[PDB]
Amino acid sequence: EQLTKCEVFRELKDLKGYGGVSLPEWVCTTFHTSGYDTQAIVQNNDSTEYGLFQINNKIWCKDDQNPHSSNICNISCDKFLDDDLTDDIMCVKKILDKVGINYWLAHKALCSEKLDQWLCEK
C-alpha cells in the first residue's frame, strides 16, 4: 500500500512535535525508510523490519522468525503491515521515548535540513 506524501502528512498528525520531531521531519523520515509503503518488509541478517516505519522484530514486536523477542511494543509485528497506523504510531512513540529519533538512520542523514519541501496544503 503505497501512500502519497500528503496522505502521510495527514495520517501522522498524532506525531506532530512529539519528542520535538516536526511533522515535516516525519514525512521525510518515513519516505527514506519505506518509501511510504505500509507493507514494506526488509530483512537483513537476523532481523526483519516492518511497515511504514520499519519497526524491527529484534526488540519491538514479536513475530514468527523471532519468538524470543523482547517485544517492547507488546504487539505482533504483522499489525504493522495493515492500513491502520494507530498501533504503529503508538509503537513509534515508545521507540522515540527510549532510543530516540536516531533509530531512523535517515533522520540525521537527510531529514534534519530542508524540511519545507515535505509540507502539504489545504
Binding site for Ca(2+): residue ranges?
Answer: 79, 82, 84, 87-88
Cβ proximity to Ca ion: between 79 and 107 the closer is 79
The count of residues interacting with Ca ion (CB under 5 A) is 5
Q: How far apart are CA 37 and CA 116, in angstroms?
A: 22
Q: Would you count residue 82 as binding Ca ion (CB under 5 A)?
A: yes
Q: How far is the CB of 49 from Ca ion (least distance, A)?
A: 14
Cβ proximity to Ca ion: between 74 and 112 the closer is 74
Given candidates 18, 22, 87, 106, which one binds Ca ion under the rule CB under 5 A? 87
Q: Would you count residue 84 as binding Ca ion (CB under 5 A)?
A: yes
Cβ proximity to Ca ion: between 37 and 82 the closer is 82
The grid cell for 81 is 503491515
The grid cell for 112 is 534534519
40-53: burial string, b at 16+ Cβ within 10 Å, e else: beeeeeeebbbbbb
**Four-CA torsion 74, 23, 56, 68, nearest 10 degrees:** -20
77-110: burial string, b at 16+ Cβ within 10 Å, e else: bebbbeeebebbbebbeebbeeeebebbebbeee
From the annotation, which residues make up the binding site? 79, 82, 84, 87-88
Q: Would you count residue 37 as binding Ca ion (CB under 5 A)?
A: no
The grid cell for 79 is 499489525
Cβ proximity to Ca ion: between 13 and 108 the closer is 13
Residues forming contacts to Ca ion in the complex (CB under 5 A) are 79, 82, 84, 87-88
